[PDB]
Amino acid sequence: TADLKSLAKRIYEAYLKNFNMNKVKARVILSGPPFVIHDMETLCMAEKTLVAKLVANGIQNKEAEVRIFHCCQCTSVETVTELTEFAKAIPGFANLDLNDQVTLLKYGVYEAIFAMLSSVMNKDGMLVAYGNGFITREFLKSLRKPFCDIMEPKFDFAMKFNALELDDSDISLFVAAIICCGDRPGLLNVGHIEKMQEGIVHVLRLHLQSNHPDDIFLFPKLLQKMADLRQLVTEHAQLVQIIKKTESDAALHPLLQEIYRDMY
Amino acid sequence: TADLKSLAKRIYEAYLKNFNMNKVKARVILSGPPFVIHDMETLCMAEKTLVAKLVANGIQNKEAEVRIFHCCQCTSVETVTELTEFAKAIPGFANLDLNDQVTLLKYGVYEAIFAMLSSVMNKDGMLVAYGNGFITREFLKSLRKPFCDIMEPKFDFAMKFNALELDDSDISLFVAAIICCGDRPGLLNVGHIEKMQEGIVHVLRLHLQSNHPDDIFLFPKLLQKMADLRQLVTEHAQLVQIIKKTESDAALHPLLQEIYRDMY
Numbered sequence: 237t238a239d240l241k242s243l244a245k246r247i248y249e250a251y252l253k254n255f256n257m258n259k260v261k262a263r264v265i266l267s268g269p270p271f272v273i274h275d276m277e278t279l280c281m282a283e284k285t286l287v288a289k290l291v292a293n294g295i296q297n298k299e300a301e302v303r304i305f306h307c308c309q310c311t312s313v314e315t316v317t318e319l320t321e322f323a324k325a326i327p328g329f330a331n332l333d334l335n336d337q338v339t340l341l342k343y344g345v346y347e348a349i350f351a352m353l354s355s356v357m358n359k360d361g362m363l364v365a366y367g368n369g370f371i372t373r374e375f376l377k378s379l380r381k382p383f384c385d386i387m388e389p390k391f392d393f394a395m396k397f398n399a400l401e402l403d404d405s406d407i408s409l410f411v412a413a414i415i416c417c418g419d420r421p422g423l424l425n426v427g428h429i430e431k432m433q434e435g436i437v438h439v440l441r442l443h444l445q446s447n448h449p450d451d452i453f454l455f456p457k458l459l460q461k462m463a464d465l466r467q468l469v470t471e472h473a474q475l476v477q478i479i480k481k482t483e484s485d486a487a488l489h490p491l492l493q494e495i496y497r498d499m500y
Numbered sequence: 501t502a503d504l505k506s507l508a509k510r511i512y513e514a515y516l517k518n519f520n521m522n523k524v525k526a527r528v529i530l531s532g533p534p535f536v537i538h539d540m541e542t543l544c545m546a547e548k549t550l551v552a553k554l555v556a557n558g559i560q561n562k563e564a565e566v567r568i569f570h571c572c573q574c575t576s577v578e579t580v581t582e583l584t585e586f587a588k589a590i591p592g593f594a595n596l597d598l599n600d601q602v603t604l605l606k607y608g609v610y611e612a613i614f615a616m617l618s619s620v621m622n623k624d625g626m627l628v629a630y631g632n633g634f635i636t637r638e639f640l641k642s643l644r645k646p647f648c649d650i651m652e653p654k655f656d657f658a659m660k661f662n663a664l665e666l667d668d669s670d671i672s673l674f675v676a677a678i679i680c681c682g683d684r685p686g687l688l689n690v691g692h693i694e695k696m697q698e699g700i701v702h703v704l705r706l707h708l709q710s711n712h713p714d715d716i717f718l719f720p721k722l723l724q725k726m727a728d729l730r731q732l733v734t735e736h737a738q739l740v741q742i743i744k745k746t747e748s749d750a751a752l753h754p755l756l757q758e759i760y761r762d763m764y
């Protein structure tokens with residue numbers, strides 16, 4: 237159908253326009269020159285070049301694990317802004333009640349964040365700082381608990397997600413499907429959201445048939461990844477709560493505090 | 501450092517002196533009275549007042565899309581002259597081999613042009629004709645293909661670039677960083693250019709820390725905008741080639757023909 241073929245392109249176009257990183261761009265960088273962060277020496281070097289404001293305090297600077305945690309949060313905050321503008325190209329999203337738009341983004345942003353993080357991850361590490369650094373997975377594993385425990389589950393998810401070999405045309409529809417879940421708690425107009433979601437899911441199913449004819453199960457596999465991402469976020473929010481309670485130096489950004497507030 | 505603080509000011513001063521339009525000036529005009537070009541009637545009116553020589557041929561005049569294309573090129577040619585004189589205040593630029601100065605300007609001018617165009621653009625249109633007109637983005641979208649396709653990608657870039665809220669002190673250093681890229685094809689003294697570039701990039705990093713303490717990622721964001729601008733120019737040059745081959749009325753200015761010659 238031409239209207240559905242266009243809906244898929246509108247959403248893909250909105251994705252390419254609103255996210256600073258996409259999978260084609262990430263793959264070009266990941267092939268090879270981002271500065272490699274693989275130990276404490278190179279973390280401190282990268283900090284002086286890529287985030288110099290943070291380490292300009294002398295002995296007042298925070299422990300390395302907490303600086304990394306802060307920089308991960310700053311990355312998330314940026315992605316929430318990108319996700320918020322992308323959400324307007326989903327048909328009917330801007331016609332939803334303003335409160336419903338807030339609730340959908342509230343529960344969807346971290347599922348979308350972890351899905352899209354896969355695009356900049358490989359089995360050895362991930363791009364950081366707008367593509368200018370690459371931090372190794374082994375370095376992130378080396379951080380003291382509980383900060384190391386934030387990281388590896390996201391790689392575990394991404395390695396299996398990346399094995400599906402989706403492209404940006406697929407992932408844009410997937411992220412839109414994540415944002416339009418009609419079973420989020422607190423929704424006012426559930427019925428309208430379900431019809432909005434059904435239209436996107438309908439385009440996602442047809443698109444996957446067209447773009448991945450070799451994988452007859454790809455649509456139900458992606459439905460399962462959405463459920464897996466919900467569980468990943470529930471687990472992530474618990475671990476973030478442990479850090480907030482037990483690490484007095486690891487302040488939560490206020491935008492992320494509101495996202496987490498009464499989430500799970 | 502006082503020498504670096506002075507290098508940043510020397511480059512800012514060179515920017516304010518050599519460009520006819522700067523962002524403060526553009527913002528004052530954009531607030532409000534430039535003549536508004538929003539349809540064919542008002543394009544023809546503006547032409548008689550602001551570019552009267554071009555439409556003084558009667559039925560010999562060119563189709564409106566081609567007149568606009570010509571006037572955009574005339575704007576570019578002017579900006580290349582401005583960029584060429586600005587480039588002298590970059591430390592070491594005038595000490596480079598004359599051939600290297602040519603190569604740097606060759607690959608840098610359009611990246612700088614599109615970065616600086618953002619200063620006169622908003623989501624509704626852009627200033628034209630030395631600040632005396634404002635042409636609407638919707639009008640530019642309304643031009644027949646392929647001429648409409650020249651325009652909107654530049655607005656897409658500018659809307660995200662403008663969201664960074666840079667000022668002229670930032671943009672002058674950014675444009676200098678663009679011109680001193682040591683990875684341009686054809687360079688004779690790559691090493692000297694890399695050291696020249698490192699000095700400007702070093703001042704840009706410290707300046708951004710000083711002028712935007714609120715945005716710890718601003719320097720890597722701008723590194724990414726430089727890469728985005730290179731891709732924008734590659735795409736622009738392809739579209740210009742399509743126009744040259746398929747629109748016999750749309751002559752390329754000779755200065756711009758030489759810039760494009762063997763570029764990408």
Ligand SMILES: CC[C@@H](Cc1ccc(OC)c(C(=O)NCc2ccc(Oc3ccc(F)cc3)c(F)c2)c1)C(=O)O
Pocket residue numbers: 279282283286287303304305306307308309311312313353362363364365369371386387388390391476492
């Ligand atoms: C706090 C948890 C988040 C969710 C979350 C979970 C897992 C992640 O990755 C596995 C990521 C994430 O963003 N990884 C990219 C990244 C990694 C290191 C960074 O640190 C630096 C430090 C210095 C540098 F010079 C460059 C990078 C960084 F800045 C970004 C985010 C939240 O709850 O919002």
Ligand SMILES: CC[C@@H](Cc1ccc(OC)c(C(=O)NCc2ccc(Oc3ccc(F)cc3)c(F)c2)c1)C(=O)O
Pocket residue numbers: 543546547550551567568569570571572573575576577617626627628629633635650651652654655740756
């Ligand atoms: C040919 C492509 C260029 C690159 C390029 C690409 C995109 C652009 O903007 C999105 C611009 C540009 O200059 N926009 C300002 C502008 C717009 C319309 C104009 O037309 C008139 C016409 C009558 C008037 F009375 C007043 C203005 C004009 F004169 C300047 C330039 C090249 O390849 O060099």
